[model samples]
Target: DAAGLAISDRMTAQIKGLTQAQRNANDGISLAQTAEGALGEISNNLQRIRELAVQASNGTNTQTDRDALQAEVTQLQSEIQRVAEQTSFNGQKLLDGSFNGVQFQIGANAGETIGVSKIMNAQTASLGGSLTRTTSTIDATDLTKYDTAMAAGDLTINGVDVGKIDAASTAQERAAQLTEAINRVSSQTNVGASYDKTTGQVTLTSNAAIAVAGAANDATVAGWANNATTGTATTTTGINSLTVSSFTNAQQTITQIDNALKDINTARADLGAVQNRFTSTVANLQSMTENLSSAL
Candidate 1:
């Protein structure tokens, strides 16, 4: 009489590991869902910001009317901040880049590790390669120091000193000298400078909002205004930090908001791709387990 013998020890152990792998896949799915879900809402906010920017650019919109539109954008900016901070998966901070570099075991063996794509930092200020690219302009045309030399520690862009001005650095030479000096250490300062000889105006730009340790009337960076806040702050995001109170500003605002939207789209697409991988991995694992049992 043939005893009805069934499963082998090896198959049983591997099957248990398969179960563990399946659990990992499910966890990955949950994590991706949370991230993509938050990004969806954030993208929706940017869409409305674009609409408001477009509305404010209308011919009849006085600066006062534009201010009303800006108010709504401010509200939406906080909504994104909420999502960035609150969304997490099983104690992992998903949207905030704190949930980065995590690897999931996708197979029933050692070294089956695969991560669900690195989640980009979705912070309001960090989106779109740093959304709030602040610009500061300096007009040396009307400055007493236009042709004069500058002191060693006279200028700071994003808090880095521009160093001493040479003796023969006069007028256009002064502007070019300063511009060249500023661009030389662009990486450390995160500031880029350009000068037009005819205008004697220097333009400073950065990928992130600039910080000038407050130039107390320095002629070289005369127009770099200190944006110190007085009360509570409600500013962030390229869409929120940037002003749209004027027609041209409103027009410029549209592109930056769109850029933020594009950033979210890229992130969502990447997460979705990993979600599909996990779904497929789960399905294939399920089928393999069935076939393994049937073969025994």
Candidate 2:
């Protein structure tokens, strides 16, 4: 009868529509997957940025070290933006919101749709802020070395005789005793001393000028100071102030990166769920189309 032929024709058309719908869903899934992969890469880069933030926060890092870390952090941020701008599917951008309203057909009939939401703005500016290039001062004599190995002597600071060096069996002991005396009277001298045991080299820091001379007839100390004239080391120029600035910048980066990381994870989770739902819909439609076709 004509009724059976008509029913079969309707069923065939529906099957064709369902097949195209499935393809549409598959394309949507592929887009979501590409976006998720890009996000994974961004997450890893942010993780490294966080680690660098922690490392740079340490007081031991010098200006040069912090600058290097900042360079890498900035580059990572640039990469995130690059990925966002470049990630697309069939000329439709997935990460940057151009395809935010994309609807995949999941049914043979009209009005069946699955929309994908925007993941993230993904620019460096969207992450609350950009990293600052912090600077640190290289002091005139910050870590300059001076041989302190000597005999008995009087170390002077701002015209006051402050440390009395004691005699020792070796130059090493002599240097140790000298620094120990300086450390003991540091408050009175308004000066601080740092000693390097390996090289018997000494470094001095103070807001006031420091001078050293021999005690009474001890020519060794006078000769050492005069010979190592560079030992009259000038203190750091803006060392404390610059270190404070650098430390604060690193701390800010850590906080910003932490927030950015959280946002990225959320985006990834949402994308994963969206993709899974799309895949399930494709399967459901495939099954429904087959059953209806068989019944017809």
Candidate 3:
């Protein structure tokens, strides 16, 4: 098996390369990846920072606007922390408590340690906010089957009128059919849907605040669209309300315009925080890259 021999040789070569080079080269790679992960985390933070900036800028808002905006800003700050706490390389977290500073000690001989501290650990939260960024998502390839679960033939029947369907299918096929069925149900005026893969269940919650029909249980479908938002009916005029007949005097109908502004502000602040982290990470990565080049 010459091919197998070659593979083995390559693997052995890698081990040999680091084994001989020791701390200088092996530790260099680890630090480089650490810097890279930090850089990525910074970018994620920037997105939140932009969100927060917009939140603080907009005018023509109400009391609800400030409260919601502040809440989201708090969430964004926490998210920034979450990202920083998780950014790691080879199981070594940088922003979190993993290390006070990233250290790569190269010793030529006795009592001669060349320590490289590319990142500073003693940084303030406002300036050097700490957070974990280790979030894992299901592979897109694995999730593609979810779309197939809700097909008409694949749909689950609640009542006899809806009719019973076949369950004789693969897990992937069943998931796909459920996705299709849930979507079809959601298309109804008051209908909505949500699916949990953990339980292999689909829930059609109601979106309507006040039921013109009956109790939410009366909605009947297992996967009903539960209204994600709480409702508060302010004396909000509809865009085409008869009372505000005059075009100039009529307020633009942005159903939840004030709330929308608050959301934007929160998003802007989060983006700002992220941008700060990005700045720090990029500096570290760039510096490490240069150091690596010089070492080579």
Candidate 4:
């Protein structure tokens, strides 16, 4: 029968002290991992919010249907709010609205706390530069802001210069030109187009409909392209005011987005697996320290 070692007093004391320190460090690793796990939960919930937004963006539903979709989105957003605001470990809140990094000193001065803000999924968009290669997606607010700005007269569509038309242009002529262009655009792509006479809004609907991702919040249109503003209060006159354009409101588009969100969660799940691996490694190290200390 093989038994563990029994050491002499001085050597045993040294081993015992070192083992105690290792156990303390093991506690530190467990706390760090707990923080990581909490943040990951928050991220997963945010991803669910994105999926809901995508569902609402799909245009298959009536206005009421969209509203219902949005209601669920609101719920998810609120849940995310709870997670971001309340979730924590060891008295350190993981997602509490701000990214001010935390400092955890484990020694008289030696141990360093890792900044974990990047663990959250919040992302900002580029104005334009290198937009393609960004490893992240734009957050809900920024996406809504950009889409709304373009919908309003604030931004211009790149290919066409609709603004050069005379400011005093009549709606009839402007509508005719816009109608022609709408037809052309409609023909080019599967996206559908229609003009709302009451609002002077040219809303585009995709034949297949693409959904907006993230929490679906209301976004106001800021400006119009070609200097032709068309909304309730600031209606522009004539051809230049052909500022109202829309993207398709189809349910399938949102469904596609929902699928993509599932993929995002899957990727996150992979990250969680990596974290688990590290956790197991830490456990092994801690166990080894205990065994070695006892044997010495």
Candidate 5:
């Protein structure tokens, strides 16, 4: 009886170990599935690019037609890159090749493990091109012309006085000066600022969200938030930064698109294989655990 009890106790631990291993296998499955899902989106985007390439390669298409097709292709490229950078499982980047590999404990004994391969970086920059910024501009009509005396009060944007405006000048001149002030401060910060001479409007863009609040007297800056126009940017070139305007460039894009598709397929196959293995390992682990418990 003592011998049986000791064996049962040992088997009990083994069952517990096997149960944990099953859980680990499930985790690996989930990670792989997440990656697979993102890859699916990437594949779809690439297919669209392939279609556009074919359309653009047509001899009958005008220069204008090619340009329009190029626009959509650029947008598609950006989206693909976006998915790569944003996809993650449990806070780990699955497609950026940031992780070396994840080891899943598939067995109770030492060295009983399987490693999930690291995903390659699929970001736009990583793939073949850089993301382009679609600039948004505020119109002159939306901008308030400030005539407040420069000496009476200082115009502060986000609590910082960018520069002084001349009250002695016309309100238009003063508005121009205020715009310049905002431009100067924006140059010093992450937020970008530019002014149009003809439109008398100031443009603002940033890598991240920014607040554009200003002092009460600085009415122009306060109104800027209301007039701010946000736009989306897309890629304008291939991996090497060549637009798909010419026949040769379009052909190159076709090649690159095929290459990207191949990569996605490879990654998907790798993930699918690992996922299947994990699924089987989990089922086997459960079976083994049950058998051990029965013996106990």
Candidate 6:
């Protein structure tokens, strides 16, 4: 009776350990499934992103249309980031690479563990890095009839004053003077001006947004007045700051989205493989329990 009672203690420990291992495998399945669900959402948004990229690539769409299209793309990108960052299993964040290759004990004995591979990071920076600088251009009307000189308060560009210039005898000199004044404060206004020799037109360019307005002296005869020119295309980045500001930019984003989709799909594949293994391990663990019952 004493020997039989002593064996009972070890038997109970083994059975409890196997039961815990089966629970651990089942938990692994839940974690993998949760992350895969988030991946599915990311894939769906990427498809939409590709659709808009192709739409923007067309020549028929106006610059404004592309700008409008970029708004949607950015929101979709945010959603992808949101889901990837927030998706969690039992309060554990997954798919952001923080839960990479975590081991789960799937057996009663020591060293009997299985790992879940690291899911890909779906954030914008992960998909693609920053884009080259894009400077928007605004071509002003040609300055003609050098009858009057533009003063420091004559024209305002991007909220910066244009310095005073003496009345030049020729339109070319006046245009050149205007370009000089604008460039002088380029750091403060983030705007630069240039002159087209033949047309004498002053072109305003900026790497970001710009706003040019004229003062009360805007009617100066040297053609320094603001002709109400605005830039249609703007510089936008590719990663988290995605956009379709132009046909070329849109096409570039198409490839970026493709890269992100590939990243997500591969991550899903890893999760799928791990999920299957968990299921298989759970079944095997149950069989061990059955064998123990038969042994008894």
Instruction: Tell me, by lDDT, which candidate is best.
Output: 6
* TM-scores for every predicted model: 0.63, 0.60, 0.32, 0.41, 0.60, 0.64
TM-score for model 1?
A: 0.63
lDDT of 2 by residue, 43-93 (tens): 787788778878866756654565577667667767877887788778878
lDDT of 4: 0.38
- In candidate 2, how many Å is residue 80 off? 1.5
RMSD of 4: 13.5
Model 5 agreement with the true structure over 221-294: per-residue lDDT tens digits:
33343223334453343352423443434555577777777777888898889988898888889889887877
Clashes of each: 0, 0, 57, 20, 1, 0
Cα lDDT of model 4 by residue, 1-296, tens digit: 12334345544655555455445545545544665565556456545545554554443434445435545544554554566567566676644434344433222124422222233332211000111110111122222233221222222232332222222134433443333333333323433334444444444343332222122123222112232222222221111111112123223323433443453355446445544544554465466556766665
lDDT of 6 by residue, 115-196 (tens): 9987766666665434444344323334444547666666776777766778877766666666656655654665555454
Q: Please report the TM-score between candidate 4 and the true structure.
A: 0.41
Candidate 4 lDDT for residue 52: 57
Q: Which tens-of-lDDT digit does each residue in 1-296 have in candidate 1?
A: 13434347668777888888989999988889999999999888778878887886676654346657767777777888788888888788888767666789989888886687888777776765544344656665544455445576566666677677664434556656666556555647655554544455765655456665433445544334344211122224544344444444555567887887788999989899989999999998899888877867
Better of 2 and 4 by TM-score: 2
Worst 10-residue lDDT window, candidate 5:
221-230
Relative to the true structure, candidate 6 has a C-alpha RMSD (angstroms) of: 12.0
Ten residues in a row with the worst lDDT in model 3? 241-250
| Candidate 2, position 235, lDDT | 23
lDDT tens per residue, model 3, 92-193: 765443454333433223442333333432111422322211111122124333322222322222221122323424544443343343333322323322
* Candidate with more favorable, higher lDDT: 1 or 4: 1
C-alpha lDDT of all candidate models, in order: 0.68, 0.59, 0.36, 0.38, 0.64, 0.69
The segments of candidate 6 whose C-alpha lies over 4 angstroms from its true place after superposition are 128-238
- Highest TM-score, which number? 6
